[PDB]
Amino acid sequence: LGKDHEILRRRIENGAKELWFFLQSELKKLKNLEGNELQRHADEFLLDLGHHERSIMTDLYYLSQTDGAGDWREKEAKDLTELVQRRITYLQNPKDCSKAKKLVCNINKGCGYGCQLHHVVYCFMIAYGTQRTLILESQNWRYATGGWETVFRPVSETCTDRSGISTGHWSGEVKDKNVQVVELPIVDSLHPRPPYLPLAVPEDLADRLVRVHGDPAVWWVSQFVKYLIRPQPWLEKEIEEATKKLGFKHPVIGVHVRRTDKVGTEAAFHPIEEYMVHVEEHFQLLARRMQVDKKRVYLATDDPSLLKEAKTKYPNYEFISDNSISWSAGLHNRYTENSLRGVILDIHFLSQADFLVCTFSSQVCRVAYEIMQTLHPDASANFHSLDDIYYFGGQNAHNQIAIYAHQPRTADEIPMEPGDIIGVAGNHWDGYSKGVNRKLGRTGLYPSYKVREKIETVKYPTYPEAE
Amino acid sequence: LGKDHEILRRRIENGAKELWFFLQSELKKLKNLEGNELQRHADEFLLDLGHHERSIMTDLYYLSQTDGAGDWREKEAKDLTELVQRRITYLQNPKDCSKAKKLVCNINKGCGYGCQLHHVVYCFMIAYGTQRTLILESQNWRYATGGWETVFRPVSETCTDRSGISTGHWSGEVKDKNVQVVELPIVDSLHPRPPYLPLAVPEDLADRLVRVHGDPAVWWVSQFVKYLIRPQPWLEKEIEEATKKLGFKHPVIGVHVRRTDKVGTEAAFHPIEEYMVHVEEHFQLLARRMQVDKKRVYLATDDPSLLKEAKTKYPNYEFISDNSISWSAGLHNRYTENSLRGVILDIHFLSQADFLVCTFSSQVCRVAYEIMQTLHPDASANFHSLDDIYYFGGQNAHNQIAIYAHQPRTADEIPMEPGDIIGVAGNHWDGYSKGVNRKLGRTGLYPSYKVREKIETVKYPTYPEAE
Ligand SMILES: *[C@@H]1O[C@H](CO)[C@@H](O[C@@H]2O[C@H](CO)[C@@H](O[C@@H]3O[C@H](CO[C@H]4O[C@H](CO)[C@@H](O)[C@H](O)[C@@H]4O[C@@H]4O[C@H](CO)[C@@H](O)[C@H](O)[C@H]4NC(C)=O)[C@@H](O)[C@H](O[C@H]4O[C@H](CO)[C@@H](O)[C@H](O)[C@@H]4O[C@@H]4O[C@H](CO)[C@@H](O)[C@H](O)[C@H]4NC(C)=O)[C@@H]3O)[C@H](O)[C@H]2NC(C)=O)[C@H](O)[C@H]1NC(C)=O
Numbered sequence: 021l022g023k024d025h026e027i028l029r030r031r032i033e034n035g036a037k038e039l040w041f042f043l044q045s046e047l048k049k050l051k052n053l054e055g056n057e058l059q060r061h062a063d064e065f066l067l068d069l070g071h072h073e074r075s076i077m078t079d080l081y082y083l084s085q086t087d088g089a090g091d092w093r094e095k096e097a098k099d100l101t102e103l104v105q106r107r108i109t110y111l112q113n114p115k116d117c118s119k120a121k122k123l124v125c126n127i128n129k130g131c132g133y134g135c136q137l138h139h140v141v142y143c144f145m146i147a148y149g150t151q152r153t154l155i156l157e158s159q160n161w162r163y164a165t166g167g168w169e170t171v172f173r174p175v176s177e178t179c180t181d182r183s184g185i186s187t188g189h190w191s192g193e194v195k196d197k198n199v200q201v202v203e204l205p206i207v208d209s210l211h212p213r214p215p216y217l218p219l220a221v222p223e224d225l226a227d228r229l230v231r232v233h234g235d236p237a238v239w240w241v242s243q244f245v246k247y248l249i250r251p252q253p254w255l256e257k258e259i260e261e262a263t264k265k266l267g268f269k270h271p272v273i274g275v276h277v278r279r280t281d282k283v284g285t286e287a288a289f290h291p292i293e294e295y296m297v298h299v300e301e302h303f304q305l306l307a308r309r310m311q312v313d314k315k316r317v318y319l320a321t322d323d324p325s326l327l328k329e330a331k332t333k334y335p336n337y338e339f340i341s342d343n344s345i346s347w348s349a350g351l352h353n354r355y356t357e358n359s360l361r362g363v364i365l366d367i368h369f370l371s372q373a374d375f376l377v378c379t380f381s382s383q384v385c386r387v388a389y390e391i392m393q394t395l396h397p398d399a400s401a402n403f404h405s406l407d408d409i410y411y412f413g414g415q416n417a418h419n420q421i422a423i424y425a426h427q428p429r430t431a432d433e434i435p436m437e438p439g440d441i442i443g444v445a446g447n448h449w450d451g452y453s454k455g456v457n458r459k460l461g462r463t464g465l466y467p468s469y470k471v472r473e474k475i476e477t478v479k480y481p482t483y484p485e486a487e
Numbered sequence: 488l489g490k491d492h493e494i495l496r497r498r499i500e501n502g503a504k505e506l507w508f509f510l511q512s513e514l515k516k517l518k519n520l521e522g523n524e525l526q527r528h529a530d531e532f533l534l535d536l537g538h539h540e541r542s543i544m545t546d547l548y549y550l551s552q553t554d555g556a557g558d559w560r561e562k563e564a565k566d567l568t569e570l571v572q573r574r575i576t577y578l579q580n581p582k583d584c585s586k587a588k589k590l591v592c593n594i595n596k597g598c599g600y601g602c603q604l605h606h607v608v609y610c611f612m613i614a615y616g617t618q619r620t621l622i623l624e625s626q627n628w629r630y631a632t633g634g635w636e637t638v639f640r641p642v643s644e645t646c647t648d649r650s651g652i653s654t655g656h657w658s659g660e661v662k663d664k665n666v667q668v669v670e671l672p673i674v675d676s677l678h679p680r681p682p683y684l685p686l687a688v689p690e691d692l693a694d695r696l697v698r699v700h701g702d703p704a705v706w707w708v709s710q711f712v713k714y715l716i717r718p719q720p721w722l723e724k725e726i727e728e729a730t731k732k733l734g735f736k737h738p739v740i741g742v743h744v745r746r747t748d749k750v751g752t753e754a755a756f757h758p759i760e761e762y763m764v765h766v767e768e769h770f771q772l773l774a775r776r777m778q779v780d781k782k783r784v785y786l787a788t789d790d791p792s793l794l795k796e797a798k799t800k801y802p803n804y805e806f807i808s809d810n811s812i813s814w815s816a817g818l819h820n821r822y823t824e825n826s827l828r829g830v831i832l833d834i835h836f837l838s839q840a841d842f843l844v845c846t847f848s849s850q851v852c853r854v855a856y857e858i859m860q861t862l863h864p865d866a867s868a869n870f871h872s873l874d875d876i877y878y879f880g881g882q883n884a885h886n887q888i889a890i891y892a893h894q895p896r897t898a899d900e901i902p903m904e905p906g907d908i909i910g911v912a913g914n915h916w917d918g919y920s921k922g923v924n925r926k927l928g929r930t931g932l933y934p935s936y937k938v939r940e941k942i943e944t945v946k947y948p949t950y951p952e953a954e
């Protein structure tokens with residue numbers, strides 16, 4: 021047993037006990053306050069609590085690193101990524117393209133870049149599950165009509181041809197077993213659905229992923245994002261130069277403020293303050309474990325007026341942003357190579373940040389969070405979403421398991437017993453989540469701490485010939 | 488790295504995050520409430536918080552046991568106590584008593600049994616530090632004219648005679664080096680003070696103790712308590728029979744309610760409810776990790792009227808108590824063997840409980856807590872004191888180290904910067920502790936979470952010839 025592990029475990033324990041002592045005492049006083057005295061005392065209470073909570077979180081961070089846990093988690097996440105990229109690379113590069121089984125994906129989904137890239141991700145995972153080489157058709161891509169290879173490497177070096185002695189539209193892995201070339205539709209219309217879909221992870225990796233990562237579902241998705249966005253030389257250089265021209269250095273927190281056409285249809289308008297309270301909380305947390313010279317935000321937004329508002333409102337922050345990129349994102353110019361490369365850079369710099377604050381309703385932020393998983397052993401928690409939890413559009417049902425019983429106080433709450441399967445719809449970031457107790461057929465609110473994530477697995481191929 | 492260790496670390500981490508989400512939302516609601524609606528919602532808040540907090544503490548319990556940590560902690564705590572008892576036993580049993588260096592302690596200190604027992608402990612620790620065999624003089628012991636051996640085994644099998652070619656009163660380890668027999672006074676008057684005093688622990692054991700135990704100072708004291716209280720046969724049998732006749736079985740929580748002459752000069756009167764809120768909270772905590780058939784309290788008190796009050800007020804509790812022992816403890820009849828036997832048994836059963844609720848101002852409770860440390864790997868945290876933190880009367884200055892800065896909000900508070908040495912006077916069990924900032928000469932309140940205990944060491948002998 022390690023001395024620092026044991027000291028830290030006890031300090032976390034004691035810090036939580038003193039937090040409970042503190043709460044009881046202060047809440048008892050609050051009960052006897054009125055008017056402004058109550059609001060003064062409640063605000064001072066919350067200030068004191070935040071620092072206290074962060075001390076506990078900081079000690080838990082240190083506990084994650086003791087006794088070589090940091091070096092090990094890093095080495096094991098490296099091996100898991102090398103192994104999956106090895107297998108993906110093997111599947112995508114057969115010797116004989118003319119005889120290879122293939123899956124054809126068309127990039128041209130009626131949506132934006134994040135949605136299109138996630139369509140390709142979904143095609144790829146199904147290609148990997150069916151041992152079919154992914155063929156990406158990208159001519160007339162609305163963002164770059166020359167296609168994918170305008171920015172990214174081709175998804176194969178040996179097999180980009182879709183020819184085959186037999187071709188058909190997806191009808192299921194069993195029916196298609198002797199169809200050499202299968203055309204896959206968008207997940208929104210896929211029938212029948214195979215099991216090679218999020219949020220499940222490969223059976224053969226599940227136990228190693230749980231040791232390392234707090235949301236293996238995202239890690240698994242992130243491996244296909246990693247392979248897809250391998251840059252062309254010139255895109256690599258453009259990112260290196262942008263990194264230099266902008267002052268992009270750590271520590272930095274990425275903020276994605278999505279507006280324009282999203283507002284009303286798929287998400288709400290969120291004022292800048294809703295993002296920056298979390299940014300400030302997380303610089304306060306970082307400052308407890310490292311020197312913070314200056315507070316840097318990398319701001320990606322499709323509102324080109326925001327940067328001036330943010331700078332004015334938060335003068336102690338250094339905002340790193342390319343406002344011309346933000347202009348490029350207006351619908352007058354969104355579907356152009358100029359705008360495409362802008363969102364690719366914005367996503368890259370969000371992904372590279374130390375923490376991410378955004379709306380997960382936006383595919384852009386999700387892509388950045390997915391990529392972030394490839395830059396750390398476990399970045400599963402390095403985010404705040406103002407609205408949705410992580411999801412992958414088209415995923416199978418995201419179920420939780422109740423670990424503690426719940427008795428509803430209001431009719432907006434659902435009851436739970438341990439073992440009950442809970443279909444989560446969201447976390448409200450207030451202590452409560454929303455979902456359906458599938459056992460009871462009842463939908464409503466439940467305390468987020470009383471459930472556990474249900475990791476789902478699938479028997480994927482293991483590509484042993486890749487070793 | 489262990490799957491269960493990592494899952495638990497993340498669930499602790501996430502449980503604390505949801506606790507902070509929960510606090511913010513509910514406090515913001517409370518700010519806008521008045522009157523009874525405020526008190527209803529604040530009481531419901533505190534109920535909700537208690538279960539949430541207990542979930543976090545329960546997960547922290549499980550993390551302490553993962554990956555064989557429990558088996559390891561137990562083996563190492565067993566080895567440490569076998570080693571120290573081996574050394575103490577060696578020191579106490581020289582082959583040649585006539586030539587042995589000796590330290591003479593007189594039990595008849597002007598106080599009660601726990602105080603007299605700690606006087607013997609304090610003599611013993613200095614005896615162990617000076618390589619002198621402890622000679623205990625106990626004739627005319629107020630509790631027993633037969634002496635120590637009325638209840639306990641003699642502290643030596645070979646050397647109980649106090650003879651020597653040279654005898655003197657303590658004058659310091661160096662001056663007394665050629666004095667064969669040194670008479671030690673009470674700690675209240677010991678001058679000059681040697682280093683072999685609480686709360687310091689031996690140099691040679693500290694790194695192992697910090698790995699195993701959350702308060703090494705108490706563990707060290709407990710090793711001498713362990714040796715002293717080896718019972719005579721009749722007392723050993725009395726303890727076994729009382730165990731059966733009282734129905735003493737686990738789970739059980741010990742409660743010591745000290746009144747009579749303690750009240751006013753050395754401690755306050757505390758109503759039974761002040762003890763039982765903690766008793767109930769800790770049965771609620773136990774219930775999260777084991778089935779609790781019946782809630783047993785072992786009640787030790789010198790108030791013979793309390794047991795009937797407790798049973799009436801807490802009818803779902805099973806109170807295990809010996810009211811005739813409590814009657815025997817009255818001031819009028821306190822100092823006789825039957826009463827000595829009573830407090831030895833009461834202390835024994837408090838020590839054997841799963842948790843201890845009492846006033847650490849009472850020497851009776853401190854003995855029980857000390858003995859408890861010998862029955863578990865790390866029972867340093869198995870207690871609630873309504874007043875004092877652990878202390879050993881006569882101890883050297885109990886210092887803490889400030890780890891996080893504090894800016895005082897009121898004139899009741901002291902400032903702290905990291906590294907400041909804090910002489911603690913108490914924990915108020917409300918989030919705040921009381922002490923002196925030695926750097927500044929400032930006395931007052933500080934958040935308890937902003938300090939760390941300062942473990943003190945002393946170069947004691949290691950008695951290698953004992954192996
Ligand atoms: C057209 O273009 C589209 C992009 O513009 C493109 O992408 C699609 O875009 C839509 C709109 O953004 C997006 O829909 C969202 O999907 C979220 C995921 O829903 C999943 O997973 C959640 C858990 O997170 C479950 O609760 C859902 O039921 C659903 O699971 C389904 O499960 C079944 C089995 O039970 C499976 O068979 C299905 O496969 C599976 N579906 C999917 C899609 O995987 C969902 O959370 C979003 O709902 C929220 O936003 C709505 C507004 O857009 C609100 O009306 C709704 O109430 C939700 O509000 C949230 O409520 C929470 C709880 O109170 C709060 O905490 C949140 O803050 C709050 N959020 C907001 C924003 O208010 C929403 O439905 C698709 O996922 C996405 N699809 C893909 C593939 O990318 C389309 O594909 C394009 N179509 C074409 C034909 O080209």
Ligand SMILES: *[C@@H]1O[C@H](CO)[C@@H](O[C@@H]2O[C@H](CO)[C@@H](O[C@@H]3O[C@H](CO[C@H]4O[C@H](CO)[C@@H](O)[C@H](O)[C@@H]4O[C@@H]4O[C@H](CO)[C@@H](O)[C@H](O)[C@H]4NC(C)=O)[C@@H](O)[C@H](O[C@H]4O[C@H](CO)[C@@H](O)[C@H](O)[C@@H]4O[C@@H]4O[C@H](CO)[C@@H](O)[C@H](O)[C@H]4NC(C)=O)[C@@H]3O)[C@H](O)[C@H]2NC(C)=O)[C@H](O)[C@H]1NC(C)=O
Pocket residue numbers: 596597598599602605673674675752753754755848873874875876877878879880881882883884885911912913914915921
């Ligand atoms: C006569 O019989 C006695 C039997 O009762 C016998 O034993 C003595 O008994 C007394 C009374 O019970 C007992 O006094 C208590 O000692 C506590 C320990 O004091 C230590 O440690 C604390 C930290 O825990 C320090 O803050 C202290 O300053 C002191 O440290 C001293 O440090 C110096 C160097 O700095 C050393 O050189 C000294 O050796 C060292 N002193 C000692 C004694 O070791 C102490 O905490 C107790 O104080 C509290 O209770 C008092 C009432 O008894 C209150 O007046 C006082 O304000 C304290 O209140 C506490 O305040 C906290 C903060 O606000 C709260 O959290 C607490 O809830 C609150 N408690 C209560 C109960 O209200 C008290 O002084 C002796 O320790 C004990 N001595 C021995 C050796 O057993 C005598 O020896 C007999 N005499 C003779 C001649 O035979």
Ligand SMILES: Nc1nc2c(ncn2[C@@H]2O[C@H](COP(=O)(O)OP(=O)(O)O)[C@@H](O)[C@H]2O)c(=O)[nH]1
Pocket residue numbers: 131132133134135136276277278282320321322345346349354359362363364366381382383384
């Ligand atoms: N450069 C840049 N473009 C953006 C930003 N936000 C939105 N866009 C553009 O608007 C599109 C939104 O479509 P999509 O990626 O599917 O994300 P979603 O609509 O937010 O769910 C993006 O792909 C970009 O083309 C941003 O912060 N920076």
Ligand SMILES: Nc1nc2c(ncn2[C@@H]2O[C@H](COP(=O)(O)OP(=O)(O)O)[C@@H](O)[C@H]2O)c(=O)[nH]1
Pocket residue numbers: 598599600601602603743744745746749787788789812813816821826829830831833848849850851
């Ligand atoms: N049997 C028994 N005796 C007690 C109890 N509380 C106090 N006494 C008696 O009162 C004495 C108190 O003296 P002491 O041990 O120095 O403890 P303190 O006064 O509480 O600090 C004890 O030794 C007992 O003789 C109790 O709960 N049970």
Ligand SMILES: [Mn+2]
Pocket residue numbers: 298301302404
């Ligand atoms: Mn946060």
Ligand SMILES: [Mn+2]
Pocket residue numbers: 765768769871
């Ligand atoms: Mn407690």
